[model samples]
Every structure is written in C-alpha cells, then in structure tokens.
Target: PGRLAGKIAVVTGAAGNLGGHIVTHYLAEGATVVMTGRTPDRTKAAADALLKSTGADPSRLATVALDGGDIASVRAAIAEVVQKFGRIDILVNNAGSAGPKQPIENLPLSPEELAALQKTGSTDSETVADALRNIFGVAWNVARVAAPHIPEGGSIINVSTIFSRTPYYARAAYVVPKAAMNAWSRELSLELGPKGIRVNLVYPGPIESERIRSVFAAMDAARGDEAGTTATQFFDMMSLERATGGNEKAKTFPTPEDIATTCVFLGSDESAAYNGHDFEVTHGMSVRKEQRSTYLARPTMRSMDGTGLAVLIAAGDDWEEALEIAQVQLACGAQVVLGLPRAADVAIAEKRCKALGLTEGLSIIRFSRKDPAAMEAALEEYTRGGTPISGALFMPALGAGELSGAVTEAEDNAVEALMDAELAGNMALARTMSRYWKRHDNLLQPPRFVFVSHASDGKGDIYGHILRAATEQLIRIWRDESEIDTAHGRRRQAEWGNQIVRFTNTEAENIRFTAGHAARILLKESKLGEITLYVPANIGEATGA
Candidate 1:
C-alpha cells in the first residue's frame, strides 16, 4: 500500500494508451481500481492483461463497460462503481480526441461531402463535437453521480491537451473540444473546492505509448531513402528547443509513466494545494513564453476603411472588454450596435460612450438572452437607417457555478436558458442580419460574423465552447450552401454573403485589444472566411488559426 492505499479510484478509458499506464500505476500504489472501457469484453481483456502482467490480487481490481457518448451508459458505469466500491476517492476523465486525421487546409467539407455526411447521420462538426461533449460533459455527469459518495479531500483529475494553448494546424475540431475542458475544470474547482473535493486539469504534451511507437515506425518506413526521417525526428524538429553550441542535441518526448506519476501525485495528498489549476507535463516542450499581440495594430494584408459599416456586438458580463471592442469599432469609422442584457447596463454603456466621445455612430439597445425575439427586434431597429449592416459579434454569457452538482429540473432549465441566450440568440441575430445583407447587397465586402470568448485570463466559462462550436457549425453550413448555389447556374460567393471569425482573449489584461482586433476583421477589405484569431495581452506572434 502506497500513498493511495485503500483508495477507490475510477479511471475511464483505461483499456490502453495513457489510461492503461494510469491504471497500472494506481494499482501499484495499492488503490482498489475500477477500469472501464466502451464495452465489457474490452474492459475485461484490459483488466486481465494487467493482472497477468503484474500478478496482483484480483480482489483489488474490477472492470465495467462505459460508453462515454451515451449518458445512460455513463450513469450505469458510475452506478456499478458505487455498487462495487461503495465510494469513489479519485475520478479520472481521460477519453477524448476523436477527430479526422486530415489537415485543416483540406478539411473543409464540399457540398457533396456535407450532404453525404448528413445522410450518414452526421456532419463533421456534429460528429466531432459529439465525442468532445461526451468526453468533457461525461466527467461532469460522473462527478454529479459520485459526489454524494466522495468524502472530503477527494480529487477529480481531468486530462486535457497542451495543444489547447500551443495549437497545431489541421486539428481545429480536435483542439476545440479539449479547450473547453480547462474551463469546466476551473468551474468545478470553484463549486466543489469548498467541499474539499479538489478538481484539477493535467495537460500532457506528446506522450510516447505503443500506438505512438507504431506511428513513428510507419513514418520512418514511408521515408524510404530520400533524406530519411522518422516521426520522432519530425516532432523533435518542431517541438524541441535549439542547441547553442552542440551540433546535435537529443530530443525529448514524455512517456506514459511520466504522466502517470503526475496523476498519482494529484490523486494523493501531495497535490492538495493544486485546486482548479492546470498542471502541464510537457517537459519544457511548451514552456517557452512566445510573445503575441493583444491587438491588430498593423494589417497582415491591407487596411480598409469602414465608412458605412454597422456591426452588432452582443454583450456579456464583461463590460470592460465589450467597451474596449466598441471603442475600436468607433475608431475604425464603423457604427457599433451595442446589445445589453439589462436596461441599466445600456444606460451605463451610453454614459461610457459619451465620456469617450463615441456617440456619433453608436447605438445602444436593450437585449435579453431569455428572448430571441428581443434580439431580432433590436437588430431590425439598429439596421433600419440603411447603414448597411456589415457584421455582428456574438459574446458568450454563462452562469457561474451552474456546471456543478446533480442535474436537476432547475439545472436543466438554467442550461437551456443559457443556450437560448448565448447560442440561440446569436443564431437569431445572425439570421436577421444575414437577410438584411442579402436584401441590401452591402458595399465592397460581404457581411461578417465574429464570435468572441474570454478563454484565458482565468475566465473559464464552458458555455463559450458551445457558442464557438455553434458559430463554427453555422459557418460550415453556410459555406456548403454557397457551394451548392454554383450548381444552380449562379456563383454568388459574395451574395451568400457572410464571413465568420472566432476570437479568443488568451491573456489576462484589460486592454482594448479585443475591440481593435475585432474591428479590423469586421472592416477588412478582403473576404477572409472562417478564421480563428487569438489576442494576446502583449505584443507577440500568434500561433495560428
């Protein structure tokens, strides 16, 4: 018996890869472990294989079938754990990352592809998001079930990806799902920390497992003889730091045991101080502090004036960030249609605008997340003056502490209300503005839609994930619709008439960067479709879309 001796730990996705190592380590530490897989045979085989390798007491281990995507199956797995162990001390949510293997450059679906996928009971976004939600949301569902059984000082370990911060190309769908896990972990920490049930996220970079070794071997063989290279060489060239004096320096990749050790620490009493925090196990691979810009001060392409531009900005609780964005729009010579949840907020914003001398082209309207009709009405009035509505920004709004505890009728209602306010409300506004742009046939550029969410800066709101996903899905569908129009003997790319941009504030600063960056995209001269930008707190190069 080690530090976790006699503890009842439940590990999801424990059949192979990183999860298997975690299970192995937990058993080595003397904890009674529950290993789960998507089905019974897989779980039993995994457990039996481990038993045969370690020759451990069979009484300390158990196996159960768990389908992360199915809530009923998830609940059943939790019930089985409780029925067997009586209580859960540690819960590891480690299953996710089910996305296409293609690069982002070639990932956009054509009209035929979209139609085929829809016929097959899926769309690219919906399919990837389904697995993402099942992995991320199932953790919450499991916690809700296990909370009553858990005692004080329990630990909930949420496994995330370091790629969320340092993003790579061709994995937008893969990264977006895991990005929300960080926020959800923080929310859970806040709600459950007081109860002594600490929640923390572990972000592991590249880990070398059996699957990775096989991939590396295949890549090496595919290289043949022309400047032969292995997957390790490829990853090392990109991920490792440079050597100053040495001609050759060894590259490093984290092993499964390394990650398992960190998990064991968090599950034990050693990591009591870490609550709702992110622990990265990248081994200096992601530790370098790369500088990035908070605002789009200079145009990467060219600058364009926005003389008759009018863009609707949906407001959340972060009035400072919203105001900064509005100021940027005003400075760029674009009209700002500010939407607020309360009447008092509108008055305060108006006063702020007056102080800043931006009332000439500013419009303030009372909006409600509770009512989509309210958004539709406010949008119509804002664009009634024939200002040529160019674009709209959808800001995320989520209730704090709402993601914890059991899912009751009230909780369901609260979630629905949030979706109505954040996701549905934006779609309603988009539809209205899209129609306006189609009827009026705006200036040089088509109408653009931008979604802003504060992902970094300790503002971990999981609802932002839904807002981003929904907007991305809208963009994809709209793009496909545009492609289908060509078959009708009309190539109205401009008439399809809307560009979507997703922006994330990744730093903790109260600068006007959000406003400036958003204003540039909304007022840019060219048609930049479906781009994702990250606004840093200071000047540095952005990773990529």
Candidate 2:
C-alpha cells in the first residue's frame, strides 16, 4: 500500500498551482482526495485536469464548490463531503487573500488601527467590523466546520509564509492572516490533539510555480520601481542567489512539487511525531552566510536608543555568565534589570556593574528562579511606568557542580534542576510576558522572549563514562604491545586532544553568545535560527578547567 492508502483527504484551493501539485501528490500516494475550488465549474475543471495528469481511477477523485471567505459556504461544502464520503482524513488550508498592498505608513487598517490612533480606544466589541476580511478565516472556518468529521489520526495542515516571522514589505493582508494562521494552528494542535488530530503549519518562500511567477511579473506590471525592486531584493536574500552574488540563472526556490512532497509527509503516517511545529521550506532563505562561517563577523544588532527594550534577566547562581549576555545587550543601548537569584548576587552584580561603568544602565533586585509570582512581579514593576519591556531571559545554573570542581557536592533538590521553579518559574515568566503583550501589543513592533536550555555530551576526557570504559576495555582486550604504543594508546591520546573541548570557557562563551543572540532576534525581530560560534584558536585564555 502507498503511504496514504485508503485515506480520504480534503484540499482547499486545489485549482491553484501549489494546491494542484499537492492534490497530485496525494492522489499518486494512493489517497482518495476531494478537491475544493471557488465554484462548481472551476472545481470540475481542476478535477478534470488532475484526472488526466495522474491517470487516477475516477472513483478516487472528486470535487466541491467552496468559497473560503464565506463561512456558510465553507460549512455547506464540508457537509457535502461528510454526506458523500461519510468521513474525512486530511484537511489542508491553502486558500488566502492577498489584499491591498500598502506600506506601513500609508496603510488602511481593519478599523482598529484607525480606531485606536484616531482617538481614545473604545471598549467596543463586535460593534465595528474587521475590514470585511478573512486572512486566516478560510483555514479557521474550514477547520471549524470539518473538525468533527476529522476523526482520529487526521491531519490539519495550514499553509503559511516565512514573512510572518521575517516580514515582507507591505503584504499586510496576506502576511498578517498567514501569521494568524500560524497562531491558530498551534492552538488547534492543543485543542484537537485530545481527539487524535495533529495540527501543523508549513511556511514557504516563493514557490517555483506559474502562480508565483505571475506575482513576480505583477511587480513590474502593476507598480513599477519599488515593487519590482522588492522582487529583486527577495532573490538577493536567497542562499543560492547570495552565494552567486545574484548571477544564478536557474531559480533555487522550492518548486510546487517540492512543497507538495512535504505536504504528503504531513498528511501521512511518516511524520507521526511532528505536531505544533513550523517548517520553513525557504531554500535556507532564513539564515545569513556569516552565521554559518564566521559568527564573530555576523551582522550585529542595531542600536536600541533606550526606548524600545527593558530586559529582565534571571540566571540564579550563574550570574557571571548571565551578566556576560546582559553586558552584550547593554552595548547595544538597553536597560538591564537584573533579577539576581540570591540576595548576595544583588551586591555581586551591583559591584560588577559599577566596575564596568554600567551602574547608570543597570538595576538590581533579589529574585527567585523557584518563585513564579516573584518573576511576574519583577517583570511588571520594571515595565509599569511606560518604559516598555521588549522581552526577558531566564537561565538556570546547570552544571554548576562540574564547573566549580565539586564532584563530591550533589545538586540541591535534583528535581529543581530539571522542573519545578527552574522550569515552572521560566514558564511563569513566559506566561506573564504573553499576557502583557496581548493587553498592550504594538502592531508595528512586538515583544521578544527567550529561555535557555542546557544540554551535556560527555565520554572519557570530554567523553562520558561509557565511552571511556569502552576505550579502556578495547586496550585491555587487545595485545599489551598495541595498548602501550600502537593502536589502543594512540586512540586514548587522540581522545585527550579532543578532550580539550572540556575546557568550560569555550562552552560558557558560546552559551553566553546564544543568550545574547536570542535577545537580539527577539528584540530587533532578528533572524530565526542559531549560528555557529568559534571561541578563537590558540587564544589559550582557557579558564575553569
């Protein structure tokens, strides 16, 4: 049997290039797919083309008239599917509206943007309508009507854009709703997961399809100059285009067939463990070249000017390392509010900041990484006076025992090291920041949040106990001659050189850079993923061995 054998799937916007490819893949993969178009004639036309393309059994393919913008129409279309097939297996929300393209300054809002800035914000709920729009509505409405029919083991995939994270110029109607689609997709996984449905979103760059090519063509046809320039800028940012200095003749973007492949996986059992994840199929468009090669040479963050961000940092016993991150942000002109874990840490940071000439931009208070309420209160008081808190960073002092040369000393409350306050406290910080954002969210700019996760990989030297023992056992089993000067001892010597990585200085610096890098992305709406960092060769400034 094929991957989707005996499965029934409903794909919206099936007449379009990307959706057509998706339907083609599903059919080829042995699925009985129902393609929904905007009208009966259009649906029939798409079904006809697909029938010939796949040479599929006519019984395995069907069509329906579904308009995503009209809620009643979507409901009725889904009802028709259940009435006809009696069950639904996969639902893909691929239909969307690319509404009026207006720059942020010249943009017209859904009345709320106009309403808020025009005068005093109203307590109006359901009074004035939202621009007569539905960016995420097609997906939302379709899923709402189809959820009951989507039985256990069903997949709901929403097509989204990378621009939601790293925005596209003035494509608000498309970008905002797509971003909304991403948010709802997350909520859907949590809500529908109990019923055995997995919800996920796929973010794509410009697909190598006729439809998107028409869009690129419209840049010059509809509005010349800047609009055309925008298209060029998009290509220039691509990994292939950038690497070639913009001379690549063949487009490096994912083709319609490429996108269709991932959708097939999402709609099949092959991707069983994935849920609530955003996959970026952008041809590495989201990363920078410097990030991969030379992190130190990577483009740094822009200046903050002190108005945009007030950072909340809680690192518990790892104050020094956390301070390294804070100091990096301070260089970019942000106010650092240190929630030192212990009372003694307050004086440690105060004196440290004083010595670094950072007393003017720094504040200190006693905080508990174990107390959720305290973390919330600390975030609140700092931002209550209109100072604007962009985001927070919470670090747990993991591996303190090993770093401090205390093998005999055991961790206090081993559970605390993993869960409870350390984990729960960070959870509280994130929850509180989200609540704050919902109430006072800035449309032009949103807040940033960061939480540190620690991991360890060790064998002998740098290798953990298991690998060390295996290496030793290999030498013992082999001839003593080889153990002394040939193979076995040489392997151990090679491990000792590799063990130089155990020097915690290099490890700590990378973590510190990651902490700062996370803040940079969160604060400035920076890049999405992490990059490689080298602590430099032969600097030999190794410490805490």
Candidate 3:
C-alpha cells in the first residue's frame, strides 16, 4: 500500500490548473481521489489529462460537477462520495477565488453582498460580498457539509492566498476574505480536532501557474500602473519556509507541484501530528508554523472537558439575562465566573442557580455598578486559582433612557454616565482576563471577546452609538493601545490578538431561551477563535429577546 493507499479523497475544483497537480499527487501516492470540477466537461478533461499526463489508474479516479457556491449541490456531492466509499478520508476544499482585486471603496455591494459582508469586521468594500462568497462562503459550505461524514483521522485541507496576512495595495477584496477564511479554518480545526479529524490551511503566494500568469498578463495590459509595479513587489514579498541542508536552489517561482506536495502530506496519515494551523507555501512570501504535537498533546476529550475549560462573564445591568447565558456554558460542561452588578442580583442568581443545578457549576462574584477596581480584583483573584479561562463576554447595560422627538441634554448626560461606568467595569474585567489568558497558548494567542447588547444600531441614540463604537474599537485595536506603558518606556509586542464576528443571529422562541441559545453559540464559536459577535439581527431589532 502506498502512503494514502486506502484513503478515499475528494478534491474540489479539481479541474483547475493547480488542483490537477493536487489530484495527481494524491493518486500517485495511492489515494482513491474523487476529482470534482465546476462542470462535467472540465472534470472529464481532468480525468483524461491525469490518465495521459501521469500514468494513473482510471479505476481509482472519479469525477463530479459542482458549483462550489451552492450548498445543496455541495452537500449532495459530498453525500455521493460517502455513499460510494463508506467515508471520505480526505476533503480538499479548493473553493474561493482570488479574483476582483480592488480597494475597499471601489466595490458597491448588492443585497446578498450586504448580507454576506455583514458578518465580517468594521470595514466596507463592495468586493467583499462577491469575493467573500467565493472564498469564505464556498469554503465554509463544503467543509461544513463534508465534516459530518469525515471519519476520525480524516483530513480537510483548505486553500487561501498569502495576502491574508500581508495585505497588498488595492487587494482588500482578496485579502480580507482570505483573512476571514483563516479564522474560520482555525475554528473548524478546534471543532474537529477533538474528534480525531484535522483541518489545516494552505496559503500560496505567486506561483508559476496558469492562473498567476493570466493575472500577471492582465496587469501587463495596464503596463505602467499599480498592478504592474506591484507585480514586482509581489515577488519581493515572499519568504522561505525552509532551506535544504543549508543550501537553496535558485528558481523563478514555486509551481502547483509545490502546493500539491504539501497537500499530499496533509492528506496522508503521516501528518497525524498536524492540526488547525497555517501552512505557508508562499515561495518565501510569509511564514507560519504548526504545533500539532502540542495540539495532539491536548486533553483527549470533548473540547469543553473538565481538563478545565472556563469563561468569565461580567454581566452588567443585564446580569439576570446572563444567568441564562451561564446555564448554557454549564450545559456544555464548562465552569463559569459570573460578575453580578448588585447584591440583590447575586441573591437572585444564587436562588436561580440552586434551583437549576447551576449552583455548584459556576462561581458568583458581586462586581458593583461603578467599580472597575472591584472587577479587576475579582479577575485577578480568579487567575490565582491556577486555571486560565478560555474566553469571555461582556453584556453591557442597554437601557439608555428614552429619546422621544424632543430629547433633552440631561437625558444624554445621564445616558453617557451610565454607559461610561458600565463600559469601564466590563473593560476592566476584560483587561484583567486578557492578561490572564495570554499567560498560556502562543503568547500572542488571539483572544476571543463576544460583545452583545439590547441596543439597536439604527435608533441606538447616544448610548447605542457608544456601545457600537466601543465594541468596534475593542475588537479592532483598543487592546493593542492598552499595551502602551509610559512608566516602563517599552514598546512591547501585543500579547493579545482577536478575531471578531458581528451581525450574526442565533434566535429561537422566547427571550430566555434566546439568551441561553446565543450563549451556547457564542461559547462554541469563541473557543474556536471567533472573537467578536453581535446577537439578534441588525437594523432596529431590539435584543429585548
């Protein structure tokens, strides 16, 4: 048996120039690869070329036509692979395209584009919707539907560009979506890693391939503009992943073969040591490393196992609703440290917890209404227990005083004070938690912060505006700024990095059920590296649920 002898693999977009090499490598290494292109003719051509170009066994090769963007079609296709062979051992999610290179302002979003980009960060670019659907949507769609059928020890390989990390000029459309994919890939790895299935990402730089050539030639048409000049910048941007015996070969660029070899390793059982990380094949563009040994060394149980997964919730005025949130974590077998704003709220929570079996599961702290110092002390004391929390959430008090047609200055002033105090306490606790969690993991391990409020973005009044602004700044670069210590006179690298999510809704029947459900979703997603999330729908929908 060859390296991948019995492993049945499904390679999406297999008819493409780069995908052909990936399929050939899988088959050459003895995988029964299911080659799928976007059309029958394209897929059949791939089979023909594989047979003629690389002495391949036709019996081991299968073909399918797929519109990668269509989830139903993707699910059906994966179902076919599972039906044909008992399970799929390798799934190469070759979805997403690097098309549409434009600045953020140039692209105007269509309606669905608006829906698609709504879940990403604070920036807006018309190309986001179109490009995001291709890379993130298609990538997420295929991997998700295929995940269920992926048996233990199975592998899902995702593809993106090097631009995800090193953003090039006017390439926001391509880079932003790829960056989003990188986050999702980490999330999927966390989700599947515990199940013995592995998810890894591949970032390719300018490769010597048909696609890159055309992109370059397209720029050649402009001849003297930015793409032409940036074309050389692309070559200079690359960095090496390794050197062969302290020696190197002088080559123009890496080819599809380089990427295919990397995939073959990832697709095979030899890579059992790997999971949930960035594998850069950028021909010296940007570099990243994987810690599979450390990953595999993790507690061999549910991701939320008692090896001690916990979270802190500084429940502001919404401390009552946060109980429902706390219950969901307790349901998932996680310990919770909840900060209640009032003594009355604490007693009420105690009674509620006792009644609902949440008493012994979580710790209760009486964090006062305007005391960030108390909040800081609570977080500091908790970290003294020797177990670090996995993540955190802040439920800001959203009851900004009423703003009728004729609003008065006092109402605005009162709203500001309440909002400031609430934010101060939450941010302080978050500050302490941020320091606490970074003590482990990659010191720069991206911290996940989930933000939610009952405030509406449209009619949010002044309080609503502050909520959104602070939430944005927190996820964006507020923590980075927090590192500036004038006393020490040191500009240190930020120990904290975050990946945010917004405009996502996980709603069900009633308000209580919704809070608990949203809590479950938030924790699940946050543990997987989704840092920022907004609950309920956008527009003026009140999160009064």
Candidate 4:
C-alpha cells in the first residue's frame, strides 16, 4: 500500500504500447489498476508480458475489451471497471491511434480503412472526434463516470500528445485528436476545479512504444521504404541535432519506463497543483521553440503566390466560375489556390500552378471534400511561414454539383461567410486572426489580409467589408502605423462593366497602412490580440442557428 493504497484506477487502451507501461507503473506505485483495450488476446499478452518482466501479481491487473469509437463498448468498459473496482479513483484514456496511416486526403473508406477511420478518424477527423472522445469520452466522459467515485483528492490523467502543439507529417488525425484532448484537459480542469477533482494532460513526446512502431510503419508505407529503414531514418531526423553523423550519437529511443515515471508523477499527489497543465516527458534536449516550429511547419505548403493564398479550384468537378474567378485573382496576386476535387482529372488544373511557378517553394496542400482542420491547419501553417500570406479563396457552390449548378447565390453567401470572419462586417474574423497571429506569430508574414471576392466586386462592400472590419481590428492590436503603406487612397474607383467600381480603396489604403501589424505584435510585450468584439453587431452571423 502507498499514496494510492486504497485507490482504484482505470486506464483505457491499457494493452497498448504506452498503456501497458502506464498500467504497470500504476501498479508498482501502490494502486489497483484496470486496463481496457479492443483486442482481448493482445491486451492479455501485453499484461502477461508486464507480469513476467516485473514478477508482479497478475491479480492486481485486470483487462477489458473496449472500442473507443463504439459508444456502447466504451460505456460497457466503464461499467466493468466500476463493477470490479467498486469505485474509480483515477481514469486514464490512453486508447487511441488505431490503424494504418494514409494521406488525410484518402480517408480509409475501404471497409477495413473505414473501420479504422471510425476508431481514430484521420488527422482531418481528429479535431471533431477529439471533442467527442478526448474531450467528451476521455476527459468529460470519464469525469462524469469517475467524478462520482473519486475521493476528494482523486485525479484524472489524460494521455495526450506533444503533436497537440506540433504538427507531424501525415499524422493529422492523430495529432488533432490529441490537441482536442489537451483542450479537454484544460477545460475539465477548470470545470471540475470546484469538485476538487484535479484534471491534467500528460503530453508524451516521442516515447518508444508499439504505437510509435505502428506510426513508423505507416511512415514506411507513405515513403515506400522498408519499415525498419523508415524507422531508422525517422530516428535519425529526431536526433539530427546531436547526431554528428556518428554511431555513438544514435542513442536508443525513450522507454515505456520513461513515460511510466511521468504518468506516475501525474497520478500521484506529487503533481497536485499540476492541474490543467501539460507536462512534457521528452528529454530536456527536445527541440526548442524554433526547432519545434520547423518540425510543425514542415507540412506547410506554398500558396499560389510566395505569400499564402489558399486555392479552391476543384479541378474536375464544380462549376468553372469559382476557378475562373480564382484564376483572375491569381493574376492579380493570390499565392495559394485551394480546391476540392470532384474528379481526379481536375488535379491537372492544379498542376498548372506549378507550371506557372505557383508551387516553387510553396506546397499545394490538398484537401478531401471533408476534413476542415486539415484545411485550416494548412492555412495556419502557410501564414506562419512569415511569407506574406495573401488570402483564402473557396468555391462551395461548385462543390454541390449540378444540383445547384454554378456557385449558387446561397453557396456564394456560404463562401462569403467562410471568409467572412476576415470580412469587415464581422468582428469574429479580427478576433480570430489576432489570436492566430499570437500563437503562430513566427509562422506568419505581415499584412495578413486580402479580399478574395467576385472579380467584379473584389473591392466592393462584400469584399472590403470584412477587410475594413479586420483592418480596424488590426489597427487596435498593431498600434504602429509607420509601417503601413497607404499609397492608394481608401476608394480607387475603377470602372468594371456597367457598375461603378465601388470599393473601400481608401480603407484598403488605410488597411495597407497596417501591413506590418503582425510583425510588431510579435515583438511587443503586451497582448496584441486581447480585445473581443461587442455582441449584437452581426455576431455569430454565419452560425445560421
């Protein structure tokens, strides 16, 4: 008996690589541990392996089958834990990252991949599912069940990933899920603060486990190399800093014991105030902020222009109107052209950007018709490169197919709404951009605004409204105007067709004046993007609630 002498705890994905280590560590620290996994045989084998290696009593450890993606299985697993243990003291949601890796663009729809997709949902699916599992299931779901059983001092330890903060190549689904789980930990820490039940996230960074092996296997498949070869190469990249290209520098990867110790600390009272916090267990030699940024930024892509301009030309499908309009913008100065594909043939149209040199150093981050986070993260990463990210363009109406025909008036409104946050009429855009700049300051270039609207009305209210609104917001956060280049007055009235070329050119000039806003905010001490917009002024306008 020890600190948790009378405590009973539950760990999900218990049979997993990290889960096994976590379970064994908890048992050693004087607690009753119950582990859950999807495959009973594999889980038992893992547990039996631990018992054999440690000479521990097999009775102290228990196993149950759980498919985290299946609500019923998750519920049943929880009930079993409760039934056997009498009450829960700690709950660890460690089960995740199931199945092979594939381009986020290729969601595993093959019955097998689809089944796997349901468990972890690729990078694109992680953000939302994270809310459901890590946030709801692991953090909230476990909390709801265990909160009633936990003693006053009991704890809830969430197993998230360092990928939550950094972006790993081809692991968007896994990383986003962890990121959401991390958020859930923070939120629960706050919500359960009153209950005296502490909530925290154990941010494991590159621990050597079965999951890591599986991750490497996927990497191998992606790169068309043997699994071990890919794994060794990855380890090489991970240690490139200290690796002077010598055998001596190639240290063995971190063990489950390393993570086990961290988990023990979180589970014990030693980490009492560590509530709502993220404790990194990777060696202190882990990459610093800049290195970390590079790692996360690796997946970043180039926009059509040197700056970040997301293209929405779904080459083979949708109406040519959005693509045509986008082409006109491209000529004007758009950098990244983002599009959703209707047919594989359209990929050819996107290739045109490369022939035109749009992809010189830029990455053409493609998206499946689904997965919003993958899309947003691409935008975030591009802007983060500090490469004068110009703007975002989309064609949702074309996405609806002939049913709606060309970009519908409604789709136009939706696209407008999509880009509307950066629009003038909505404060949400400014508020969001401010926060985005703050977190990803180093990744972004300056003058973070460009209106991607109809060619006929690119500078009109529909276009400039968001720009003007965002410009005003920019002025507040980035107070220095000396860097702004307002060479053009607010409205540059040009003649387009029968309509007066109405636009906020002067405002655009004013907006241009704050081009260096992002840079200054980065160097400033004060919180640049701290302000919020007042409600009732076109607030949540696009929520359509």
Q: What are the per-residue Cα lDDT tens digits for candidate 4 across 1-545?
A: 66566678788777767887787778778888887766899888887887887676777788887664345675677788778877777877677753223323332323444556666644433332332343324433445545666777778888766544442434433443454355446655765667777887776656654466787677666445467754564354353333322336554455567777877877787777767776766444243221100011111122233333322232224434444444444443444444444435346656765576655333444543343345446557665665533233222222222222111122323322322222211222222333343344343333233222222233223322222222322232222211111212211111000000113222222111212221122211223222211112121231232
Model 3 lDDT, residue 535, Cα: 39
C-alpha RMSD of each candidate structure in angstroms: 10.0, 17.9, 18.3, 16.3
Index of the highest-lDDT prediction:
1
Error (Å) of candidate 3 at residue 7 is 1.0
Residue pairs with backbone atoms closer than 3 Å in model 3 (clashes): 107-126, 238-284, 238-285, 239-284, 239-285, 240-284, 500-532, 501-532, 511-545
lDDT by residue (tens digit), candidate 1, 11-100: 987886888899889999988999877768978988999998877799988988776546577678888888888899998887664553
Candidate 3, poorest ten consecutive residues by summed lDDT? 290-299
Q: 2 or 4: which has the higher lDDT?
A: 2
* 97: Cα error in model 3, Å: 2.2
Please write out the lDDT profile of model 2 over residues 356-435, one tens digit for every residue: 88775677787674554575577677666666666566555343333221111213232223223332243344435544
What TM-score does model 1 achieve against the real structure? 0.60
Q: For each candidate in the order shown, give its overall lDDT on alpha carbons.
A: 0.62, 0.57, 0.59, 0.46
User: Model 3 reaches what TM-score against the true structure?
Assistant: 0.50
**What is the per-residue lDDT of model 3 for residues 424-444, given as tens digits with 9 covering 90 to 100?**
343344445544544443322
Q: How far is 504's C-alpha from truth in model 2 (Å)?
A: 32
Number of the top-ranking candidate, with TM-score as the measure: 1
